[PDB]
Write a protein that holds these residues in place. Structure first.
Motif, short mmCIF file in Angstrom:
data_model
loop_
_atom_site.label_atom_id
_atom_site.label_comp_id
_atom_site.label_asym_id
_atom_site.label_seq_id
_atom_site.Cartn_x
_atom_site.Cartn_y
_atom_site.Cartn_z
N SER E 1 0.82 -1.20 0.00
CA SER E 1 0.00 0.00 0.00
C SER E 1 0.86 1.25 0.00
O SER E 1 0.96 1.96 -1.01
N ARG E 2 1.48 1.52 1.14
CA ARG E 2 2.26 2.75 1.25
C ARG E 2 3.60 2.64 0.54
O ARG E 2 4.06 3.62 -0.06
N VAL E 3 4.21 1.45 0.52
CA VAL E 3 5.37 1.27 -0.33
C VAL E 3 4.95 1.08 -1.79
O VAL E 3 5.77 1.24 -2.70
N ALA E 4 3.68 0.76 -2.03
CA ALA E 4 3.17 0.72 -3.39
C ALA E 4 2.97 2.12 -3.96
O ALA E 4 3.04 2.31 -5.18
N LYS E 5 2.70 3.10 -3.10
CA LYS E 5 2.58 4.48 -3.56
C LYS E 5 3.90 5.24 -3.48
O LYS E 5 4.08 6.21 -4.23
N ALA E 6 4.81 4.85 -2.59
CA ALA E 6 6.14 5.45 -2.56
C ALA E 6 7.02 4.75 -3.60
O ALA E 6 7.35 3.57 -3.43
N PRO E 7 7.42 5.44 -4.67
CA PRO E 7 8.07 4.74 -5.78
C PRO E 7 9.59 4.64 -5.67
O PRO E 7 10.19 5.06 -4.68
N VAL E 8 10.21 4.07 -6.71
CA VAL E 8 11.63 3.73 -6.73
C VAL E 8 12.43 4.95 -7.19
O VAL E 8 11.89 5.89 -7.78
N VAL E 9 13.74 4.96 -6.91
CA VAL E 9 14.68 5.84 -7.57
C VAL E 9 15.69 5.00 -8.35
O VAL E 9 15.92 3.83 -8.02
N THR E 35 10.33 -11.99 -15.14
CA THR E 35 9.10 -11.79 -15.88
C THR E 35 7.96 -11.67 -14.88
O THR E 35 7.37 -12.67 -14.46
N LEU E 36 7.66 -10.44 -14.48
CA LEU E 36 6.67 -10.15 -13.46
C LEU E 36 5.28 -10.56 -13.93
O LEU E 36 4.99 -10.64 -15.12
N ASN E 37 4.40 -10.83 -12.96
CA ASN E 37 2.99 -10.96 -13.31
C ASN E 37 2.43 -9.58 -13.63
O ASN E 37 3.00 -8.54 -13.27
N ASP E 38 1.28 -9.57 -14.30
CA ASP E 38 0.81 -8.39 -15.01
C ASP E 38 -0.28 -7.65 -14.26
O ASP E 38 -1.24 -7.15 -14.85
N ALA E 39 -0.17 -7.57 -12.94
CA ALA E 39 -1.09 -6.80 -12.11
C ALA E 39 -0.51 -5.45 -11.71
O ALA E 39 -0.76 -4.97 -10.60
N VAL E 40 0.26 -4.83 -12.59
CA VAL E 40 0.90 -3.55 -12.30
C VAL E 40 1.15 -2.82 -13.61
O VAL E 40 1.56 -3.42 -14.61
N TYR E 57 -8.27 -5.60 -11.94
CA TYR E 57 -7.87 -6.68 -11.06
C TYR E 57 -8.67 -6.64 -9.76
O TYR E 57 -9.40 -5.69 -9.47
N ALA E 58 -8.53 -7.71 -8.97
CA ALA E 58 -9.17 -7.81 -7.67
C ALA E 58 -8.20 -7.51 -6.53
O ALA E 58 -8.43 -6.59 -5.73
N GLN E 63 0.83 -7.17 -5.99
CA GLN E 63 2.09 -6.97 -6.68
C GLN E 63 2.61 -5.55 -6.55
O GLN E 63 3.82 -5.34 -6.72
N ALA E 64 1.75 -4.60 -6.19
CA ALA E 64 2.09 -3.18 -6.30
C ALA E 64 3.16 -2.75 -5.30
O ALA E 64 3.88 -1.78 -5.54
N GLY E 65 3.29 -3.46 -4.18
CA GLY E 65 4.36 -3.16 -3.24
C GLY E 65 5.51 -4.14 -3.34
O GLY E 65 6.67 -3.77 -3.15
N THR E 66 5.19 -5.40 -3.66
CA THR E 66 6.22 -6.44 -3.72
C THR E 66 7.13 -6.24 -4.92
O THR E 66 8.36 -6.34 -4.80
N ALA E 67 6.56 -5.96 -6.09
CA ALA E 67 7.36 -5.69 -7.27
C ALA E 67 8.13 -4.39 -7.12
O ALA E 67 9.24 -4.29 -7.64
#
Ligand SMILES: [Mg+2]
Ligand SMILES: [Mg+2]
Ligand SMILES: [Mg+2]
Ligand SMILES: [Mg+2]
Ligand SMILES: [Mg+2]
Ligand SMILES: [Mg+2]
Ligand SMILES: [Mg+2]
Ligand SMILES: [Mg+2]
Ligand SMILES: [Mg+2]
Ligand SMILES: [Mg+2]
Ligand SMILES: [Mg+2]
Ligand SMILES: [Mg+2]
Ligand SMILES: [Mg+2]
Ligand SMILES: [Mg+2]
Ligand SMILES: [Mg+2]
Ligand SMILES: [Mg+2]
Ligand SMILES: [Mg+2]
Ligand SMILES: [Mg+2]
Ligand SMILES: [Mg+2]
Ligand SMILES: [Mg+2]
Ligand SMILES: [Mg+2]
Ligand SMILES: [Mg+2]
Ligand SMILES: [Mg+2]
Ligand SMILES: [Mg+2]
Ligand SMILES: [Mg+2]
Ligand SMILES: [Mg+2]
Ligand SMILES: [Mg+2]
Ligand SMILES: [Mg+2]
Ligand SMILES: [Mg+2]
Ligand SMILES: [Mg+2]
Ligand SMILES: [Mg+2]
Ligand SMILES: [Mg+2]
Ligand SMILES: [Mg+2]
Ligand SMILES: [Mg+2]
Ligand SMILES: [Mg+2]
Ligand SMILES: [Mg+2]
Ligand SMILES: [Mg+2]
Ligand SMILES: [Mg+2]
Ligand SMILES: [Mg+2]
Ligand SMILES: [Mg+2]
Ligand SMILES: [Mg+2]
Ligand SMILES: [Mg+2]
Ligand SMILES: [Mg+2]
Ligand SMILES: [Mg+2]
Ligand SMILES: [Zn+2]
Lengths: 37, 141, 58, 209, 175
Positions: E1-9, E35-40, E57-58, E63-67
């Motif tokens: 959630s919060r790491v899913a909204k805080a992005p990478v550098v 080869t990531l799954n396609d929920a992002v 998606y449901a 994936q949004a924080g893990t990837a």
RNA sequence: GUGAAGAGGGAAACAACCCAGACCGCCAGCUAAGGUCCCAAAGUCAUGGUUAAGUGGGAAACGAUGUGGGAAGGCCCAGAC
RNA sequence: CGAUGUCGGCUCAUCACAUCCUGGGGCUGAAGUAGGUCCCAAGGGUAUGGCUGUUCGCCAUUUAAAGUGGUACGCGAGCUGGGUUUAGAACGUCGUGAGACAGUUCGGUCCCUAUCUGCCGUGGGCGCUGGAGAACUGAGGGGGGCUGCUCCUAGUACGAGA
RNA sequence: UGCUGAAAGCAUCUAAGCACGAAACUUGCCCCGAGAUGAGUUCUCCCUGACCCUUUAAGGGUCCUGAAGGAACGUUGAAGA
């Protein structure tokens, strides 16, 4: 490694988790707290 | 006296279908009613009105959920300590013809004409065959 | 008798609960025996029949 | 590996420098000869088919003699087949020498059994017989009882009873070879290889040693 | 959630290849594929990949924080460097390295003659202190745990194979 | 009240359960109880939500950050965690 | 009830798993050794004797182990008849008696060629669509899996020693 | 028992994925094994004559043709009722 159908927390570091259809109870620094549902 | 389609006058067809991406329960009943032969208008119950299908690349048929492993295949042989078991993924990796042949063997009727209707199930699991000399039509389902 | 009727209905491109409803809209009293027997041979008149059901609904 | 075919003639013993009495037997092995080479594109599997021995001219039949003269070999007596693996080069006209076993320590021997007729229930499956006395009447050697009562109420499949004894293909493994014979075409293997003498056995390198 | 909204550098000097899923980042350490799954859905702002659920998606934030965390880990592995250093304990317990071999005398009649993956460069600056480098963090954690866990240190003496920075439970055999 | 002294479709078969009371004939139409993915006749009919467990298709005491909806409260850019 | 032979032995089993052995892991009030206790695991293996009619039981003695159950408390158209069971006889006890009594010693006829289903073996006809002589590929099936001890590592580690 | 790691900014073998794991499982060892009707694969040897009749051709018959190969008969066997 208990087996019970009434699991519980005892200390302040009991972490109920759910893995593969099983409600496990674990702890960081206690071998006796380690459980299984 | 209603018309009873005698077997020496009624014909047969040749279709092929590549079952990639298709589910078992929603493929097998259509392959069952095709060779049961009811989508033709001249269907009769007691005389065979069947077709010919060829199902190509049958090692790609998928069922959704967790049932690539949780679909069991029980069969008993006749020697008292000899009932065996293989699962869905092992049957797929071993022999991908019997995953479709038994699926249509269920839904097709049971008897001498049941085995007669089974006799036309020329079902493979490769990407070639040897009845293209019979000039088949690529059916879509 | 209903079997070959449903066979010709799926042959021309319509269901059965729409077909009998359209024929009840057209108030016919023709039975399953002869409604099947038309679809035995005369394919263009039964095509006209389902065209009439499609023109009663649509 | 590439098997061979022998005939068991007798049983004798080789002694040692010490005094060990090693039991041993003599399977005569003539030089076998390749008859039909297969592979996948020809038949479906890589193998070798051979034949050794000698058969008379007026009892080799017109189907067999055509297959003989198609190769160029003599009038042998059998037709045996050996499966193979890769990493080999072979032809048909070359005959296999008797010294293929000259560097293998443990071999396998298959063959037929002896024919012990319609056997018994105390003889084949080793059923312990019953009281020959002490009241017992007319049931000294019978196999007793065979099924339960009414559930199943039938004799199960896989039961053992009287029948034909042996007389089939059996296999003994990992045996001890002590000596070959370039002079009179022998193999000396330790033990008692199957079948009566006057039979032909299929010898090979041992599958697991 | 919060790491899913805080992005990478991501800094420069590196061969970035975001071909959609196969993000191969070829630089100083190495390069990682997945080869990531396609929920992002993800696009590059030349310094920052955005991260969010593809629409429909449901469990989209799975994936949004893990990837995102994995795409932190891959590029910092290529950039800086990765190891999690071990420490052998015990007299008669010795470890020798020649590039891609471990020879352990871990108390068995046969010595532990163990082999190494591709992304492992190991070194023993002291005879009982081994460190094994790499960039792929998920692989060099698991390989370190497999190379260590022939013997967890027993709770009485502390004699065994442990991490250089872990916690062991000193026990008490009562009289 | 069926059932004994009662046939028939649905409960796989199944005297007692729900539908229903068949005097004979017909290759005639509408439904009940119950069914409409194919076996075996009829909707892979439309909107519309729950479920992720073959749960559906056998069960208790108790258990739990599984899950959807409602009702209140306390703490908070006097940044609550 | 116009009858399905009953307890225990002998001979053959098969499945169940709440597992006796053996296999792998966690806890311990587990240093090692040996154990405690649940969790996964049923492929395989499971004492010869004394005593009573006896399953059991007690006892002597091994082994890794001497598992628990259903199968008409498996199995008499397969086998003993000792037990309870017919006719005789006696003792205790009861009735005046005739005779009884999960009280007891003693002696006491166990019938049958397999028609059919079933099961282990051996065979002839026909089909495999020109007919005959052979060698084979193998989808399926079926038997097979046990364990002791001594020696090396090493009298190492562990342990104060033992 | 793990590795990485959000849901729940932290711990989490699990939801994505990745690694280990025993006499049970499939194999691997061996046997009868194409009556597998889904009836197979496979290298070989033999027959290359005339006709008329209504069954108008997958049909009935007269004659030289009767080979490949098997059955039967005699001698029998470490094969056998
Ligand atoms: Mg698991
Ligand atoms: Mg079994
Ligand atoms: Mg039926
Ligand atoms: Mg014999
Ligand atoms: Mg005896
Ligand atoms: Mg007698
Ligand atoms: Mg006698
Ligand atoms: Mg009444
Ligand atoms: Mg009455
Ligand atoms: Mg009734
Ligand atoms: Mg009824
Ligand atoms: Mg019922
Ligand atoms: Mg019925
Ligand atoms: Mg009436
Ligand atoms: Mg209704
Ligand atoms: Mg239907
Ligand atoms: Mg719907
Ligand atoms: Mg419940
Ligand atoms: Mg705080
Ligand atoms: Mg009677
Ligand atoms: Mg009675
Ligand atoms: Mg258990
Ligand atoms: Mg324990
Ligand atoms: Mg078992
Ligand atoms: Mg057992
Ligand atoms: Mg096994
Ligand atoms: Mg005895
Ligand atoms: Mg005595
Ligand atoms: Mg006893
Ligand atoms: Mg019982
Ligand atoms: Mg009982
Ligand atoms: Mg019993
Ligand atoms: Mg009994
Ligand atoms: Mg009996
Ligand atoms: Mg008995
Ligand atoms: Mg008696
Ligand atoms: Mg008879
Ligand atoms: Mg008979
Ligand atoms: Mg035969
Ligand atoms: Mg098997
Ligand atoms: Mg975390
Ligand atoms: Mg964790
Ligand atoms: Mg073993
Ligand atoms: Mg094994
Ligand atoms: Zn704890």
């Amino acid at each position: 490694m208990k087996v019970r159908a009434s699991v519980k927390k005892l200390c302040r570091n009991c972490k109920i988790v759910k893995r593969d259809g099983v409600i496990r109870v674990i702890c960081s620094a206690e071998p006796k707290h380690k459980q299984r549902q | 006296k209603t018309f009873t389609a005698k077997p020496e006058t009624v014909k047969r067809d040749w279709y092929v279908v590549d079952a990639t991406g298709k589910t078992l329960g929603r493929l097998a009943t259509e392959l069952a009613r095709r060779l049961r032969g009811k989508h033709k208008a001249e269907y009769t119950p007691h005389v065979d009105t069947g077709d010919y299908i060829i199902v190509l690349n049958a090692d790609k048929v998928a069922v959704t959920g967790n049932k690539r492993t949780d679909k069991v295949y029980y069969h008993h042989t006749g020697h008292i300590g000899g009932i065996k078991q293989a699962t869905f993924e092992e049957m797929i990796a071993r022999r991908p013809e019997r995953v479709i042949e038994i699926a249509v063997k269920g839904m097709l009727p049971k008897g001498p004409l049941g085995r007669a209707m089974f006799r036309k199930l020329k079902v493979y699991a490769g990407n070639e065959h040897n009845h293209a000399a019979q000039q088949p039509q690529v059916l879509d389902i | 008798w209903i079997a070959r009727i449903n066979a010709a209905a799926r042959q021309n491109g319509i269901s059965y609960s729409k077909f009998i409803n359209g024929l009840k809209k057209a108030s016919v009293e023709i039975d399953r025996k002869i409604l099947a027997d038309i679809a035995v041979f005369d394919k263009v008149a039964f095509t006209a029949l389902v065209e009439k059901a499609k023109a009663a609904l649509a | 590996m590439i098997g061979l075919v022998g005939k068991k003639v007798g049983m004798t013993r080789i002694f040692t420098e010490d005094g060990v009495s090693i039991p041993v037997t003599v399977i005569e092995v003539e030089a076998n000869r390749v008859t039909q080479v297969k592979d996948l594109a020809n038949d479906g599997y890589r193998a070798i088919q051979v034949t050794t021995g000698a058969k008379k001219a007026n009892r080799v039949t017109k189907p067999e003699a055509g297959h003989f003269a198609k190769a160029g070999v003599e009038a042998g007596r059998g037709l045996w087949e050996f499966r193979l693996a890769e990493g080999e080069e072979f032809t048909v006209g070359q005959s296999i020498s008797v010294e293929l076993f000259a560097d293998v320590k443990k071999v396998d021997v298959t063959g037929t059994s002896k024919g012990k007729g319609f056997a018994g229930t105390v003889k084949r499956w080793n059923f312990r017989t019953q009281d020959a006395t002490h009241g017992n009447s007319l049931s000294h050697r019978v196999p007793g009882s065979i099924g339960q009562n009414q559930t199943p109420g039938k004799v199960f499949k896989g039961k053992k009873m009287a029948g034909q004894m042996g007389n089939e293909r059996v296999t003994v493994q990992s045996l001890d070879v002590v000596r070959v014979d370039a002079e009179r075409n022998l193999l000396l293997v330790k033990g008692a290889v199957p079948g009566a003498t006057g039979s032909d056995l299929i010898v090979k390198p041992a599958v697991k040693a | 959630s919060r790491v899913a909204k805080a992005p990478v550098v991501v800094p420069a000097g590196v061969d970035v290849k975001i071909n959609g899923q196969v993000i191969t980042i070829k630089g100083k350490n190495g390069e990682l594929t997945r080869t990531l799954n396609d929920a992002v859905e993800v696009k590059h702002a030349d310094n920052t990949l955005t991260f969010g659920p593809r629409d429909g998606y449901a469990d989209g934030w799975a994936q949004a924080g893990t990837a995102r965390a994995l795409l932190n880990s891959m590029v910092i592995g290529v950039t800086e460097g990765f190891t999690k250093k071990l420490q052998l304990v015990g007299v008669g317990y010795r470890a020798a390295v020649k590039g891609n071999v471990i020879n352990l005398s871990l108390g068995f009649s046969h010595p532990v003659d163990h082999q190494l993956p591709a992304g492992i460069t190991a070194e023993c600056p002291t005879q009982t202190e081994i460190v094994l480098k790499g960039a792929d963090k998920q692989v060099i954690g698991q390989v370190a745990a497999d190379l260590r866990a022939y013997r967890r240190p027993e709770p009485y003496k502390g004699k065994g194979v442990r991490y250089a920075d872990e916690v062991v439970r000193t026990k008490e055999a009562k009289k």
